[PDB]
Amino acid sequence: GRTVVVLGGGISGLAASYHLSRAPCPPKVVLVESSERLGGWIRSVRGPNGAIFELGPGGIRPAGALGARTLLLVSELGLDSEVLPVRGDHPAAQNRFLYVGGALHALPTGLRPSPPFSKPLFWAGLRELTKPRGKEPDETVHSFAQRRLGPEVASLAMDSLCRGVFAGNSRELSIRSCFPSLFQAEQTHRSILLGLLLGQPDSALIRQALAERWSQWSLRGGLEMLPQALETHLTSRGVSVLRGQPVCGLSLQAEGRWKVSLRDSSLEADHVISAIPASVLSELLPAEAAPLARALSAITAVSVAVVNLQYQGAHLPVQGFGHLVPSSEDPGVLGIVYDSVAFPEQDGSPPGLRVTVMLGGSWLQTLEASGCVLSQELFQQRAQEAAATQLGLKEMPSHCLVHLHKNCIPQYTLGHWQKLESARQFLTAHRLPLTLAGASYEGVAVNDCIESGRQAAVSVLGTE
Ligand SMILES: Cc1cc2nc3c(=O)[nH]c(=O)nc-3n(C[C@H](O)[C@H](O)[C@H](O)COP(=O)(O)OP(=O)(O)OC[C@H]3O[C@@H](n4cnc5c(N)ncnc54)[C@H](O)[C@@H]3O)c2cc1C
Ligand SMILES: O=C(O)c1cc(Oc2ccc(C(F)(F)F)cc2Cl)ccc1[N+](=O)[O-]
């Protein structure tokens, strides 16, 4: 007798529906997805020769309690046979690079001046402990990193790191919202290094991932198998999924029920879990909820072009996960991922070398805001020049895939904590049967989006 609608069929929406429907005494769950497919940015292409090309995340890092919570989900979905781990005894696990000064340079692990840093990194760690503590509520990743680590580390490492995780600009991103652990470390223990030196579910898959030290894992038919398995389960349990059915409007009525408004249809939800972009939810809210909508509309997302390239009979200069490209090296190219190093099983046959070029940054930000045309060709040449320049691959790619993802990665810029705090004070102040979830709020990683989903699910079952 209690209906919960879930908006968005991304991984957050999917996870929420999954936990809701698995409760001992489950409400009626309806999943509402605006596109033809579930899975949101998690999407995979099974090319001609049998190779997988990832269009979003290519694999997932299992480390952390969240890492472990996702491997459990995977066990529960009986996907174990299908898992492709990358084990601690491989280069794809023990090697991330930087393209700096026309060369790839290896980032250290824990073991002498390493290019492109002039001095040993031991020295920055030093002044790190002795350094004061920022007294502001928030701070940009650049400001933070620069202050505690020095100009070199900030301009190269943190700059790249923000690009690799958020496809974003570290002079924009909040250190509080982007690296909450680094931020609490510093705040709590007056020092990043200390807070780290001053510090989990279980199952067979996890024990194995702990033992073999998996640095990441993916699925054999591609990551999309995850949302695929999830959807199969929802549908089994009799959860109701509506594709190609965008939500147009939300509004409350009597008895405090929600009227979800479809194109030419409607649903009454007792509760609503929003797992769609915050900027979208914003446009769906009744003027009753202006101050919340203002908060939501303040959360924006960058775009990303993904270009997959496959080269027949080519080889890389190095073996690693991939490399990052600092903004000072290239505004448009964020990094390249060597998918074959990690997942040779997905190379097809005849097997071919696969890399994935991530395009974005200010290059693409300004093109979006221009009269210019965002052609496939434009992204193709960029990607190819990058592989040719940065990887010495001057062969024509035997295969090529180009995808522009508009507004796909939420940017947690300065003041983000406040936006969240405001949305959350409005919601509770007025006791709205609405829960928030997904990448717009408390993390963009798939691991985060899932926990995001589970927490919204749990909190919704708490209410009844
Ligand atoms: C190329 C790239 C690489 C990435 N790599 C990694 C990585 O490897 N590791 C990692 O952890 N994370 C990675 N991510 C980030 C991560 O994939 C995303 O943050 C996460 O998948 C987003 O999930 P979500 O459910 O929060 O949002 P989304 O996946 O965007 O889902 C939201 C859904 O809501 C739907 N929707 C919108 N409006 C409506 C409406 N009105 N009615 C009904 N439905 C609606 C949309 O169609 C969409 O499907 C990557 C992202 C990108 C794109
Ligand atoms: O660490 C990374 O996240 C890393 C990401 C790379 O590719 C991306 C994947 C995803 C995104 C995303 F999701 F932010 F768009 C950006 C980039 Cl550059 C390439 C290399 C690395 N790395 O550590 O060597």
**Rounded to whole angstroms, how far apart are CA atoms 155 and 124?**
13
Residue 300 tokens, joined? 């924006």
Pocket test of ligand 2: the residue of 104, 165, 338 to mutate, having most ligand atoms within 8 Å of its CB, is 165
Instruction: Please report the atom of ligand 1 found closest to the CA of residue 410.
Output: 19
- Centroid of ligand 2 to alpha carbon of 105 (angstroms): 16
Whether 12 lines ligand 1, by a CB cut-off of 6 Å, is yes
Q: Is the CB of 35 under 6 A from ligand 1?
A: yes
Resolution in A: 2.8
How far, in whole angstroms, is CA 106 from its chain's centroid? 24
Does ligand 1 lie within 6 Å of residue 274's CB atom?
Answer: no
Atom of ligand 1 nearest to the CA of 59: 8
Please indicate whether residue 405, judged by its CB atom, sits closer than 6 Å to ligand 2.
Answer: no
Cα(163) to centroid of ligand 2, in Å? 7
Within 8 A by CB and 6+ apart from 185, the residues are 191, 192, 193, 194, 195, 196
Chain position carrying tokens 């090296």: 329
| Under 8 Å between Cβ of 31 and 265 | no
* Closest by CA position to 409, among listed 169, 224, 216: 169
Residue 91 burial (10 A CB sphere; 0-12, 13-18, 19+)? middle
Q: How far does residue 55's CA lie from ligand 2's centre (Å)?
A: 13
**For a substitution probing ligand 2, which of 337, 364, 391, 412 has the most ligand atoms within 8 Å of its CB?**
337
- Diameter over CA atoms, the chain: 69
To test ligand 1's pocket by mutation, which of 5, 6, 38, 41 has the most ligand atoms within 8 angstroms of CB? Answer: 41
Tokens linked to 54: 């990832």
Nearest protein Cα to ligand 1, atom 51: 56
User: Which ligand 2 atom is at minimum distance from the Cα of 360?
Assistant: 15
Q: Which ligand is nearest to the CA of 217?
A: 1
Q: Is the CB of 410 under 6 A from ligand 2?
A: no
Distance of alpha carbon 239 from alpha carbon 23, whole angstroms: 12
Atom 2 of ligand 2, nearest CA residue: 164
State the sign of the Cα–Cα–Cα–Cα dihedral 123, 125, 129, 131.
positive
Q: Is 313 left (phi over 0), alpha (psi -120 to 50) or beta?
A: left
Q: What is the DSSP letter of 254?
A: G
Reference 14, options 351, 332, 243; nearest CA is 243
Phi first, then psi: what are they for 299, rounded to 5°? -100, 110
CB-based contacts of 244, cutoff 8 Å, min separation 6: 33, 34, 35, 36
Distance from the Cα of residue 102 to its chain's centroid = 28
Closest to 359 in 3D by CA, of 336, 338, 342: 336
Question: Any idea what DSSP says for residue 456?
Answer: H
- Sign of the alpha-carbon dihedral angle for 210, 214, 220, 222: positive
Phi, psi (degrees; rounded to nearest 5) at 45: -115, 125
Q: Which fold has domain 1-464?
A: FAD/NAD(P)-binding domain (3.50.50)
d(CA 409, CA 412): 9
Q: Where is 45: in which H helix or E strand?
A: strand 44-46
CA torsion through residues 219, 446, 411, 181, sign: negative
443: left (phi over 0), alpha (psi -120 to 50) or beta: left
